[PDB]
Amino acid sequence: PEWLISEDWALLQAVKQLLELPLNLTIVSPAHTPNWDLVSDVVNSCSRIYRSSKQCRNRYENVIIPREEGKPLRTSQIYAQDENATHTQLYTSHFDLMKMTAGKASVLAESGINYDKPLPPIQVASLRAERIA
Amino acid sequence: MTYIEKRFPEDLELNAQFLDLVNYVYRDLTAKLEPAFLSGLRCAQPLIRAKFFEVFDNSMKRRVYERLLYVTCSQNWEAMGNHFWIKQCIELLLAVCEKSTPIGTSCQGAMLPSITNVINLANQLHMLTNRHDKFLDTLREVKTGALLSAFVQLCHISTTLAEKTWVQLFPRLWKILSDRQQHALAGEISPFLCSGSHQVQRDCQPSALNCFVEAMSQCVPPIPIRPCVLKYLGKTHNLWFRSTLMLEHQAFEKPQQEILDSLAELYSLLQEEDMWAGLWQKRCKYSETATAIAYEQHGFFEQAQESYEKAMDKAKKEHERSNASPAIFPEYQLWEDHWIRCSKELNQWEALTEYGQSKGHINPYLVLECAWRVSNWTAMKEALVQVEVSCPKEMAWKVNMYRGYLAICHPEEQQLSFIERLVEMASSLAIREWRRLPHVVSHVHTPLLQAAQQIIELQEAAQINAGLQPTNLGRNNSLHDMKTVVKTWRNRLPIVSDDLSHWSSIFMWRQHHYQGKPTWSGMPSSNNAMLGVHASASAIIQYGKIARKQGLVNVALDILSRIHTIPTVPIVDCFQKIRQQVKCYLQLNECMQGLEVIESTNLKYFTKEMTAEFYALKGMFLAQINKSEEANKAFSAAVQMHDVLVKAWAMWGDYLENIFVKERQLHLGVSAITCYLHACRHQNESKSRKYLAKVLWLLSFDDDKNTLADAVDKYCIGVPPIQWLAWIPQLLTCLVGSEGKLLLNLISQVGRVYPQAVYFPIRTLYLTLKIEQRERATAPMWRCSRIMHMQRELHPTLLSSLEGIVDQMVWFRENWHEEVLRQLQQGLAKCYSVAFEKSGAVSDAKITPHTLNFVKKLVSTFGKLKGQFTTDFDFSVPGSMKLHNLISKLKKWIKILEAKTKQLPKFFLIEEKCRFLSNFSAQTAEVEIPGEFLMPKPTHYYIKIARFMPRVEIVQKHNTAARRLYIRGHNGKIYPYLVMNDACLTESRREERVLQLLRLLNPCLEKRKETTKRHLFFTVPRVVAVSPQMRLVEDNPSSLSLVEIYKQRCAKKGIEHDNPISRYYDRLATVQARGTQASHQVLRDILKEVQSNMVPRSMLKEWALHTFPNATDYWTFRKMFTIQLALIGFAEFVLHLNRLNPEMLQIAQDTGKLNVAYFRFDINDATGDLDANRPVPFRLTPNISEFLTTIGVSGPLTASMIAVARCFAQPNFKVDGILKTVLRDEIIAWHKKTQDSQQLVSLVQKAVTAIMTRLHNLAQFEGGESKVNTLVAAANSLDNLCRMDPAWHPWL
Amino acid sequence: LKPHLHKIVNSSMELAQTAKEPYNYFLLLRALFRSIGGGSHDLLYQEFLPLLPNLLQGLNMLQSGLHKQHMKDLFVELCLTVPVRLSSLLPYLPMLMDPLVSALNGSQTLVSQGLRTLELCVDNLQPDFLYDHIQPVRAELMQALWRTLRNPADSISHVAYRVLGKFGGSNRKMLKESQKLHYVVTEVQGPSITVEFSDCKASLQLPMEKAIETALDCLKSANTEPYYRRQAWEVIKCFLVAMMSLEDNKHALYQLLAHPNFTEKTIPNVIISHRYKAQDTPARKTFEQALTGAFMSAVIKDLRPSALPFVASLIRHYTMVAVAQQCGPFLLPCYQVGSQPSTAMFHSEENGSKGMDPLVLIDAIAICMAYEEKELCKIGEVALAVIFDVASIILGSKERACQLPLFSYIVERLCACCYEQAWYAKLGGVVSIKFLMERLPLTWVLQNQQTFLKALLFVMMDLTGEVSNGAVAMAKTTLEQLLMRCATPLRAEEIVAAQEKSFHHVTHDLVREVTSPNSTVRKQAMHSLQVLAQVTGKSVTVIMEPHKEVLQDMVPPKKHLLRHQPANAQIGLMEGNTFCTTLQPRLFTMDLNVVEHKVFYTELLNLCEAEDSALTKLPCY
């Protein structure tokens, strides 16, 4: 469990696909019933460790809601400010880990075989029939 | 309400109706009673349902738009999750119709005409007419509201009707909504789909959302849906293929990359790796990714892993200087995801576990899978606890199993008492996801079926440990519980197609108990330690055995290196180790190491049988290197030591033949023949066609004094006749030719045991020779007659039944109308082919002498009085001067007869005009289904004839009419056979020849992985011929040729299917008339204009879309269509076959299988040059490509062609022997047509060496993509297409 | 019970074929297997072993065929559950496998039974042997194993999943026969119903292809609750009064049907036939399905009161449409005097009848006859009478109404039911032959005399296996009456000519069938002449005299080497010779001196005198 910044932006955008700031300010005029499974699904596109649906909601309702309210930089504005440096730093570190990991015959005579002289198959075939006899 | 529903599901009548009365209280807030009111809408008693509907219907405006908003936004469907709530939506909207208007129907064409309508087309009676008018008067009182009331109710009892109604309803009323309303409605729809209320509905199979999302897609003004949500809906609501198909559509036409990411993930989820690979090769930023994917897509995971590692470091150098470029992240995630995957296939389990638990950014899921494979249980337990908290997905079934693994192989001490619930819980959970997967089983289903093998192993694994417990240890019953389960494991293995990672899962898990087993026996006369170590030794050898078969030799050596660690192995198992080790080196200065193990091992001890196999390996290994004379004695000692080892005999023969092909030493040839036949003797059925093919091949070198044939005759005893059944046509070509009297002693033995297998071929040959002779008894005819003579003495009843069947066959020949029309179709096709050859020159051209004979022969059969006086007049001379004028005459007469034959009967009963077939029955004679013996199937699996179905349907085949008679096998199945009658026996025999090859190559595909992993096979139809002319072909109905698809939609259009060819030539003539020769550009112009005016690019896609409305059916048909076309495309090129005309390709609608209508080798008439170098190597064409362009052509087709090409390139599969034997017969046929000796060898040998040139050339793998990518690009490139024959329909 | 245990089973199987109600015979075996199975397994098991080949081959044949659902369910149950343990059953295992795939489909208790037998067979047969025996059926067996996972019953799924796991890799092995896909062949709009909203007065056309089929399926179902049965009837009814165009009334209709000419002029001699029916277009397929729904809704109680007066009045309508379309007054061009049975008389997508053809009614009547539930024959028999009654009234005479081209289709279509493989479909044909014969004018029956004769003989010939729930026994009676109805001596010249010609043809067919290998048809052909010999005063040989040309090349067997024909035919040749010669006028005096008679006479002699097994046991024998 390591927290990120771009994942917060993914949370924001995912929520923007359904309800509003106070999640169900009124669940909007109609009943749209926020779907935290979908929000967890989209955010995982930018992650290597699953953000379970239950925990995904908590992060939005715990830190994002206060941080988005603000009245620290807004979540939209930190993401632009960060220049995605953290995410690049993440994969650069991972690449090193993978590279560092990436760094790591007398028996024949006793059997009646005159191994010195090959026997043409015609003789061997004929020899085979004799044993049958 | 909450308690009453669950506890007492049979007494809600009192309550349900009560809440209806509460409608008054709501107005006079108790809003929390919605979840009971909704449960009252569904109920089961119809009377209550209507009572609850009226309040629901009352509570909203009677407007289509308003109700659509209510169902989407206003209403909440959570309360009735288990229900298919769309039924209410259908009921809601259908209640807004005009219930008063009298019933009607727009489709006036289908209405039954009124009694008096005939007039407009220009006493007992009066009481009847007066009485009837009353009945009609009652009908006039029926109002449309009557149907809707009954219609709506009928949906509630049948989901299937409800599901099909909404998909057919919403798009229809979506049109009604004004463009303004549709705009707003589309705005609410997107949030509605992703709402959390549907979350409850994921599990139920026909999910309400699944039917809803399917319905919208048909809306003519497309509804925009985010690709992100589309992936989600496809993942959860078993809507997989509609999402990908819908995603593909916009991806094709249309920040424009989010679509690809969502599409890419779905393909990975569907496990359509070949299709997934094609997508990423198109969009991958780095050239490294394409090289990595292409390597990984086929195997060679050693190369793919490195190609990823190359990309990462080069990308790493980019980061320090450049920014993130957000769009690149999905690419980086690809390498990490797939570098891990390739690591698993490489058995690098230790590194992965160490990598997964790095200092930071831990990967508990990765640690989970790999930690237990190594003995690092302590890491396993840590990983499991921290993933259980976030066990997020289907993995729940996977997580539950790993609890058992920890439960069994406890870090300190196991319990294995509560595992039963664990395995049962995992098994139930695994099935839960299976319900969430598509209808047709495909690669996405593999993990569950792949897992089911290992989930059970956990349960009986617990039985292993339970016995090891001292409470029940040592007991005979428990000991025999240990023995049998171990024996069961030894015979229950996955298939080669399974990824080596899973193969590790089965065996690594089995390894733990094969190590726990020795411990208990280590405490006593306990030989069970020997059994346990034997299991691990064999299990590890078997696990490493596939790693070689997969091509990952290097890892295979490592796995076989593990067994050295074990203190002791049964000597038999160690023999497998060296045999698997020597085989590993054989597949790849490597000689020294291979020669080191072979010489070092077996210092002084082994038994006779195992010594021979060992010494046998020496010769084949020696033969590879230059030193060969020592190989001969190595074989001689090996073969004669055991004398019954097929490998020694067969491999020894290869050496003799390999030498004998050069220097033509006769005495060596008999050495090769003797070895091969002896090898096939012990071996039964398959794995002998490769050896037999040589025997027949080497038999062509035989001199006038048939020494080799004498060698064949002497040593063809013992070899059971079953093995010969695959080579009946080849034998007959030998029997008819010289020295047949020597082989006649053999065929009589094959016929003596399989009379139906040889009689039909032999009957065709003898009757074929007779007609050949009668054109102008000979020994070959006498030879054939002698076989039948004796073959009639035995099984006289069976032969009479066969001849009786064939005798009745003559009644199936088409009548004169179809017969002549067949001549016209044949004549027109030849004229077009001749016409194209005369193109560039004067477009008027002249009628060729061959064309005159056909027309001159046409009037002979024609010269029906009304037609007769016109045809002879119209054909005043058999073609006057102009070829291209003649085709106009034929086309006019094509339409005249085509309509004439349209009124001909489609039925005629067997009992009519032929009695024997109808009177035939099972007790009459045991006769196998026609064409049953075409391939010597090892198992019994033979279906007798039981009844010729009394009804035969007359059908059209590309350019002819054929009678389709349905057979009923003894098993009860109905086998539809199609009685093909055709002249030109020489051509027909050739057509069967290539089919024999494709049937001989099919077993080749199964053995290897990269081909079996894609379900590659040639789907060759079963064709057996009983005449010089007619034959029986196993035709499955619903199979319609590609050209017929063009005609079907062309007929719907206002054009004729032959317009393109006519426009191509006349347009060519206009430019040609001016004085300028046909340039390349003008060829492009006519093709481009035709493709944009008369044959639209999306012709085939349109037909498939309408013919496969269900999403899951369209994709699988397309996937199977693409795979089959790959084999057809490869075969048409590598085998140098005749071009694939549109009428030749037979598409099977039911399954998607493609079988080409009678391919044949493209051999130059003058010489056996085998020229098959037309502009495009194989038919790809726009419309077929349009079906698949962006991904299907790139990923599946290119991968499929490469996989097949690599499979045949294997030296183990003696395709050289297969091709040489079949082609030799083909060359003989060519020589007779054009008008013996070693000169035959030059033609066949040069021909085969030409085929293998293409096979290896397009099979070899370079540091990147294979040579196939170039030709497929050349196959569809407009430059090559425009240069092809117009009759080929390159536009099509 | 060890003694005469074979008689119980051997007789039970053979009797079940001929008996009218075989269900008791097979239920007897099911009772036997349960009692012997697990209760007495010392001698009976050994005594059962000789029965296995024929019994399993028998039971395998029955399930392979198609019978009533409850009948089929029993059959697959009997093929499994035989009182033979794992061993001693392997040699006949392939015969058992075909039931196994059937068991995995169908009733839940059968699915569990199929898995139960498959489960044990998996463990005890070692994978390589079992898989080989699964190869012939693996294409459909595995697809059944995959499907049963989705089944709701948890016990079924878990067991099905477990066995798939036991199938280590074979469970996912590539299939030579891919899963069959569902494809729509016709690219046309099916039947639809106009629907209009108040929204800008725009209208839709909701397709009825599923609703009509779904409504019909409800009527077919034996456990649908009465409310939905009524709704299913309403959907079918409301649809028929939609496709049926109501564009006539009283004066307009009466004048057309009161016209001269069509009541006096010779009715056109046009022959209809479904041989030329291009294909059941979705409208016609739905229309036929809609009608059979109406017919069924009439038979079932609690719906007849509002259905029978409807279907009865509807059948009168279609015949009035058919007559008005193919009778004297106007008739469509497809029914003109010299026309041919073109496709213009059937609904079609390119050259149909520009409007649904009335003949779809006959298709609905025929399908009702072939429906497994034989109670539908009674309602269908009502329709045939009704159309005949309306035709007789409208055309002014019985024999005239029978000359109508419509009845040429009725004879052809209903007779076609005798060529279906299901016994109930065949029985529907034979019943139709009996009804038409007994309710239609004698001369017309003579016109279609041979057509019925050939169809009846086929039913008897076809059902030599498991015969029926009493079909051939019904066929033989109907065939006997057919000859009696036609051959009975009368008196006008027209009728006399037809009887003389019709009698000439029938005897030609019967004589031809004297030597036929099929015992059932052969004996009846032998017996059918006897009834003719009694119906008329003509002696049997006088009846067979004109058609000597047929049997001419067999009574004297023409030395057709008497081994190139099977045992069954040899019986026919010998039996036909016996019957031909035994007649006191003794056609074809088999003189020994003449060639190919001494040969035949000697051959049958040596055949009789053959004592030892070897001489008696020839390759044919």
Residue numbers in the entry:
A (entry chain G): 2366 to 2436, 2442 to 2474, 2495 to 2523
B (entry chain C): 2400 to 2427, 2435 to 2528, 2586 to 2717, 2740 to 3008, 3025 to 3089, 3096 to 3283, 3293 to 3379, 3415 to 3786, ...
C (entry chain C): 732 to 1221, 1226 to 1356
The authors write:
Only 137 amino acids of EP400 were resolved in our structure in addition to TRRAP itself. This fragment of EP400 corresponds to the SANT and HD domains, which interact with the focal adhesion targeting (FAT) and Huntington, elongation factor 3, PR65/A, TOR (HEAT) domains of TRRAP. Within the triangle-shaped SANT domain, residues H2397, R2413, H2464, and K2469 anchor two ends of the triangle to two acidic patches within the FAT and HEAT domains, whereas D2406, in the middle of the SANT domain, interacts with a positively charged patch of TRRAP. Of particular interest, H2397L and R2413Q have been identified as cancer-associated mutations. Following the SANT domain, the HD domain of EP400 interacts with the phosphatidylinositol-3 kinase-related kinase (PIKK)–like domain of TRRAP through hydrophobic interactions involving residues L2498, I2503, Y2505, L2509, P2511, and I2512. The robust interactions of the SANT and HD domains with TRRAP tether it securely to the rest of the TIP60 complex. By contrast, a long flexible linker of EP400 connects TRRAP to the rest of TIP60, allowing a far reach of the acetylation and histone exchange functionalities from the site of recruitment. Of notice, the SANT and HD domains, which follow the EP400 linker, occupy the footprint of the structural component SUPT20H on the surface of the TRRAP subunit of the human SAGA complex, thereby preventing the formation of a hybrid complex.
